[PDB]
């Protein structure tokens, strides 16, 4: 089902790990058998004659028992160690083979499969899910088997050693079963309700953080923060219920558990008075069933973890066995070896699976003779790069055919097909290696003569003899240490060391100077001698050296010919002619709530009670042994009635104090979670638009920040305080009594307590070291994989997946060696742990026999001390591992404490800055030099000047995104210019009160949004800080020509346009934006492309409404419709961020 990828050695590993899992699991019950016999000899000899001052038989028997104990210790040492290692070794080996095969089948996975899903989903899937499988199949299975072992061994040693008492005990089990089971049903249902309610109230942060920009313009912080608080104050009503219910149930569980104790002790006191089951054989059944219970109880999550393992492994195996359409790895392909450069098309239709609601191919009918060069032209929006992608078959068209010499496209072995052609594209990307190595990846095996000859001939050798480390410089992440035009020249050097039979040239000459373009042109010209080359047209001044020239109008051969053949042919060509996360303290995570100190006080007093409950049961147990020495029945049985009651009194008091500690800290936690949620959100909204425009602080990650990390902080705040308090009581009076009683046994056993305790600590230290080194090696290989999940299309183009596969393996072999070290590191301390629990028995009891014989302390005292300390430490272990992960919520608190203090340079809350009373919309730019500090390499504005007068207009004509949106921003003061100044109304906008400035600049951006409110609530969002009269809405509702169609709707001002409001068109929700900008009576507009969904009339009506109040107040317009540009007051062009 899941262990396929297994050699034999894996199976031997697992099986020789399982048998010794069981032979470790069976190691306590045997221990209790011997404990029974030894306490029998002790109390027999003691009562039958106490000797505080012929007894050496006691010693003979106790040394015999010491051999038994330790010999048993050795047994568990070996079996523990082997269980751990062999299980985690089988884990490591199989997981390394898994990773490797998963990549090698993600590269074989087509681009349609890449068009479907996400590209961080994949890499995160890789990293996390492989760790998930690793921990799943890894070792939890070993521990689970030893759990079931100790269980069945506990019950069997019961029935074998005394059956009446075992039946008494095992009889009332089904009541504890019913109890903790309904505990589970209660708590689970309540968790579900709580989480569903939150995530119903956390889609608000995700719809007002997916759109940070429109908010931060229109001045919509506080409207949002309040849309959030209003929901957290719904969820508290269910938080509280869950608190009281879960903690009542927990108290019940302990009342019943202590009730069970009383029953058994009283019964198996009548059945010892009758001289039937002696103390030695009477304590055996008791403790063995106790151990059975505790182990089999404390290993449930080792089933949830296996379930996670399967749950992950499903999709991973689903992919490795997956097998695509035309395979990038199958050598099953009828590759010719000699062939012309014929490329004949016909009636090819092809649509996209990811985009099928727009026909992109419409039937192409072209011929390419062998060698003759056709040059392709066309306007913006037809799919040139698309067609190139097709030609090489990254897809399969619908109802047409391409061929080379009529030979089918389903013939060419894909390695042949994409190693025979070559393409330089818009931005051929460079991977993270040398120059010589990119070029070697050009083909794989070339010559240095080819190298320099291409390099030179590729117009691109001077910088090499200029570059630092001339031959081998490192073009790192996305070509930052370069010019522009060097990158296309180096791509051409790569593509020329390939010697293709068909060449493709796309927008590779966009930021060059003419001469280098002409060089590479003539170079590929003097290279084409029997082959074809297709080029996509940037400037129609160089196309002239073609055999034939082609244009497109919707994907069909529309205009075909040479220069003069088309110059009078009048189609399309003619019209185209002219991470520190600074650590935090503890004190700080606490100071995060010194406004619920009453709860902490109740809960920690109550906690110290609850936790100082063992030293009770130590002294109780001491007294039980004490009463059974001399033998006067009459008063014995009355004492034992007393002690059954005492257990009963502790069963009630335990209930109350458990329920308090639980409920109190539940309250404190819930409160602090609501406060940290609110505070962090409110702090998110107050950050300048850089921080949000990062690849790290996305909407996914921020929404996770809110919805889990807030929750997790409570771990480190409250529970860790309760837990320190508990263990201090659980093991402080332990040692205090045990010093009043054992002057010298106590020291000796204190000298072993740290091992049982610091299994976890030594493992945390060393496992943390190796987990760091691992995650580093994993992040190396993750780099190597992020590459071909980002730069996929290129890599399959060069067909050079198969080089990445081996490059990947080379690193994958890192973490596997990591695991093989972790095996031994983990196992030797685990075994000393489990191993050293027995050697303590041996030492302590043998030493106590020494003293008792010499006469230093009654046997009741050696049993006290030993129980108070050893069952002390063993209880400490379980307590601690009940907490929530403190390592994982002292970082979470760090990740919110860095989001709190981070001071934005543009404070969107500040109450300072020159407020101008009345505002004349005279906008001015002074050689503003601009670049996004995100991709900080291309200066978007290279010194720009613009100046508009009141009531007037500007309008920036040109090409798509040329540097035409950034102007829209540097007034809303999202970003600040790298250089340049935009002084407004005569004065410098780097001095105004930013909260004020955006209150005058109404904007209809390229893509208006409608929130999750009713329409009334939505437009009157157009102004905040003063509630909107219902007629104000209605007034603009007639202004932007929208009041009529409203009267058709169910709830005129009250219908709900949902999340994105899928109930709507493009021309109406765009129209609402005009309704929206106009309630503010905005001084200057910025009508960025309002008509990309505006129909004729919808715009042709509203332009009358756009301008009429725009009269007497400026506007910048950056759109694409000439018939608005013409009537404008002024004129500007933008070429590569420059005016001309």
């Amino acid at each position, epitope marked *: 089902t899941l262990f396929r990828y297994s050699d034999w050695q894996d199976k031997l590993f697992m099986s020789l790990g399982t048998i010794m899992a069981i032979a470790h699991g069976s190691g306590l019950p045997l221990m209790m058998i011997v404990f029974g016999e030894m306490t029998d000899k002790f109390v027999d000899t003691a009562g039958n004659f106490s000797f505080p001052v012929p007894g050496k038989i006691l010693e003979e028997e106790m040394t015999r028992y010491a051999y038994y104990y330790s010999g048993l210790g050795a047994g568990v040492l070996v079996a523990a160690y082997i269980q751990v290692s062999f299980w985690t070794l089988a884990a490591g080996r199989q997981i390394r083979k898994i990773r490797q095969k998963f990549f090698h089948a993600i590269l074989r996975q087509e681009i349609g499969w890449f068009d479907i899903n996400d590209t961080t989903e994949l890499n995160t899937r890789l990293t996390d899910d492989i760790s998930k499988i690793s921990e799943g199949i890894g070792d939890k299975v070993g521990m689970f088997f030893q759990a079931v072992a100790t269980f069945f061994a506990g019950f069997i040693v019961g029935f074998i050693r005394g059956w009446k008492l075992t039946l008494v005990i095992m009889a009332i089990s089904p009541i504890l079963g019913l109890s903790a089971a309904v505990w589970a049903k209660i708590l689970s249902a309540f968790s579900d309700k709580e989480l569903a309610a939150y995530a119903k109230a956390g889609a608000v942060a995700e719809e007002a953080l997916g759109a940070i920009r429109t908010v931060i313009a229109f001045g919509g912080q506080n409207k949002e923060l309040e849309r959030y608080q209003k929901h957290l104050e719904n969820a508290k009503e269910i938080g509280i219920k869950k608190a009281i219910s879960a903690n009542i149930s927990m108290g019940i569980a302990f009342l019943l558990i202590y009730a069970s104790y009383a029953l058994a002790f009283w019964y198996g006191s009548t059945l010892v008075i009758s001289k039937e089951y002696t103390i030695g054989n009477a304590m055996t059944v008791f403790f063995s069933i106790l151990i059975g219970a505790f182990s089999v109880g404390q290993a449930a999550p080792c089933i949830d973890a296996f379930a996670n393992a399967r749950g992950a492994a499903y999709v991973i195996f689903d992919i490795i066995d997956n097998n695509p359409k035309i395979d990038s790895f199958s050598e099953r392909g009828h590759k010719p070896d000699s062939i012309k450069g014929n490329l004949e098309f016909n009636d090819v239709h092809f649509s996209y699976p990811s985009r099928a609601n727009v026909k992109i191919l419409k039937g192409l009918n072209l011929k390419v003779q062998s060698g003759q060069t056709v040059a392709l032209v066309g306007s913006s929006g037809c799919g040139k790069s698309t067609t190139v992608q097709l030609i090489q078959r990254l897809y399969d068209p619908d109802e047409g055919t391409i061929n080379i010499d009529g030979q089918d496209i389903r013939n060419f072995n894909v390695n042949y097909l994409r190693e025979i052609i070559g393409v330089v594209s818009q931005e051929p990307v460079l991977f993270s290696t040398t120059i010589a190595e990119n070029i070697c990846y050009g083909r794989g095996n070339v010559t240095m003569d080819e190298i320099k000859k291409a390099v030179k001939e590729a117009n691109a050798y001077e910088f090499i003899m200029k570059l630092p480390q001339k031959f081998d410089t490192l073009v790192g992440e996305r070509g930052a240490q370069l010019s522009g035009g060097q990158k296309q020249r180096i791509a051409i050097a790569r593509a020329l060391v390939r010697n293709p039979k068909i060449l493709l040239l796309d927008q590779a000459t966009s930021a060059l100077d003419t001469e280098s373009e002409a060089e590479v042109q003539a170079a590929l010209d003097k290279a084409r001698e029997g082959r074809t080359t297709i080029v996509i047209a940037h400037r129609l001044s160089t196309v002239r050296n073609a055999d034939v020239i082609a244009g497109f109008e919707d994907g069909v051969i529309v205009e075909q010919g040479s220069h003069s053949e088309l110059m009078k042919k009048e189609g399309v060509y003619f019209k185209l002619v002219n991470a520190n996360v600074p*650590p935090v*303290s503890f004190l700080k995570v606490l100071k995060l709530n010194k406004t619920e100190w009453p709860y902490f006080v109740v809960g920690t007093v109550c906690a110290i009670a609850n936790g100082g409950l063992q030293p009770a049961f130590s002294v109780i147990f001491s007294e039980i042994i004490a009463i059974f020495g001399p033998g006067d029945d009459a008063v014995k049985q009355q004492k034992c009635n007393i002690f059954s009651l005492i257990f009963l009194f502790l069963g009630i008091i335990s209930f109350f104090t458990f329920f308090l500690q639980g409920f109190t800290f539940g309250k404190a936690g819930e409160i602090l979670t609501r406060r940290l949620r609110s505070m962090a959100f409110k702090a998110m909204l107050r950050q300048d638009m850089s921080w949000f425009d990062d690849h790290k602080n996305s909407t996914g990650a921020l929404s996770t920040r809110l919805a889990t990390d807030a929750a997790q902080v409570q771990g480190a705040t409250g529970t860790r305080l309760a837990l320190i308090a508990q263990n201090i009581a659980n093991l402080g009076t332990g040692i205090i009594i045990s010093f009043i009683y054992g002057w010298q046994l106590t020291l000796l056993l204190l000298a072993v307590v740290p091992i049982i305790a610091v299994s976890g600590i030594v493992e945390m230290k060393l496992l943390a070291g190796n987990a760091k080194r691992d995650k580093k090696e994993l992040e190396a290989a993750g780099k190597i994989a992020t590459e071909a999940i980002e730069n996929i299309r290129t890599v399959v183009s060069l067909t050079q997946e198969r080089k990445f596969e081996s490059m990947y393996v080379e690193k994958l072999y890192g973490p596997y060696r990591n695991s093989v070290q972790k095996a031994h590191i983990y196992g030797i301390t685990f075994s000393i742990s489990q191993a050293f629990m027995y050697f303590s028995y041996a030492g302590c009891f043998r030493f106590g026999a020494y003293l008792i014989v010499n006469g230093h302390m009654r046997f009741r005292d050696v049993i006290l001390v030993f129980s108070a300390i050893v069952f002390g430490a063993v209880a400490l272990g379980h307590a601690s591992s009940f907490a929530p992960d403190y390592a994982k919520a002292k970082l979470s608190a760090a990740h919110l404490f*860095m989001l709190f203090e981070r*001071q934005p340079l543009i404070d969107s809350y500040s109450e300072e800055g020159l407020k101008p009373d009345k505002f004349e919309g005279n906008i001015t730019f002074n050689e503003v030099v601009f670049n996004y500090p995100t991709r900080a390499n291309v200066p978007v504005l290279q010194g720009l000047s613009l100046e508009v007068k009141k009531g007037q207009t500007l309008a920036l004509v040109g090409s798509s995104g040329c540097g035409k949106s950034t102007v829209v921003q540097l007034l809303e003061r999202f970003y600040d210019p790298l250089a340049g100044t935009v002084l407004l109304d005569g004065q410098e906008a780097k001095k105004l009160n930013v909260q004020w400035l955006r209150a005058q600049l109404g904007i209809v951006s390229q893509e208006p949004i409608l929130f999750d409110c009713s329409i009334a609530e939505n437009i009157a969002y157009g102004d905040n800080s003063r509630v909107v009269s219902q007629d104000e809405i209605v007034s603009a509702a007639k202004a932007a020509n929208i009041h009529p169609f409203i009267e058709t709707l169910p709830h005129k001002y009250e219908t709900r346009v949902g999340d994105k409001g899928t109930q709507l068109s493009g021309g109406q929700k765009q129209r609402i934006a005009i309704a929206r900008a106009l309630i503010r009576q905005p001084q200057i507009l910025l009508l960025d492309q309002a008509t990309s969904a505006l129909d004729t009339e919808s715009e042709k009506v509203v332009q009358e409404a756009l301008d009429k109040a725009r009269e007497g107040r400026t506007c910048i317009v950056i759109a694409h419709r000439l018939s608005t540009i013409q009537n404008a007051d002024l004129i500007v062009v933008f070429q590569n961020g420059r005016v001309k």
Partner: antibody
Amino acid sequence: SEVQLVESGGGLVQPGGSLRLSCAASGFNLYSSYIHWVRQAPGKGLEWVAYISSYYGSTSYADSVKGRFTISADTSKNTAYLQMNSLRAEDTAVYYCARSFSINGSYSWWWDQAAYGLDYWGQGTLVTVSS
Amino acid sequence: IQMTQSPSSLSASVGDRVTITCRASQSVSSAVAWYQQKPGKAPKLLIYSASSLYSGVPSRFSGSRSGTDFTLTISSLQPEDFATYYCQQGYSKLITFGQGTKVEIKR
């Protein structure tokens, strides 16, 4: 590197004004040690003003400024702000930043906050309070 | 928590025993310091805790404690001296630099 504390801001205000003085450290991590704000009188003497420790979240002002000034310590870019409100005429002094000492070398503990002295300083920005 | 550099504005000549007393408030208890500042430029740290020098500092400067009568004394007086020294004390969230002294050359 070598310990390099610089300042910023400051340069003009009248009585009844705000200001922000930004002490940017360079050469060490901020949250490892304490940070103070001395104020050198124009010609008279040298008087402490405040401090903040960003690893136990503990701030503390001298009397003459309490409630009015606010410190903060942005550990996303190694910066220590001091925001000032309602400046009088007895505050035209110059305002050096400073870093209190640590003995261990790479962090400072809570016990004896800055009782070993202040070692590294910046060069003061001069501020004024004239009408 | 008040500090008094008692012999303000000293007047000693080059090559002599030179003294400074900086009597504190009650019980700072060895947590005082001694800073020497040349005019206009930031103050230096000279010695701390009243006994033990900093780094890079010459070994001609003596720090002495007695109860709460402190003392910073000199005998070398290389003319790189002649500035103003301030003996800050630091205790319980309250730090006070006291009003220091100076050293005038003789003529």
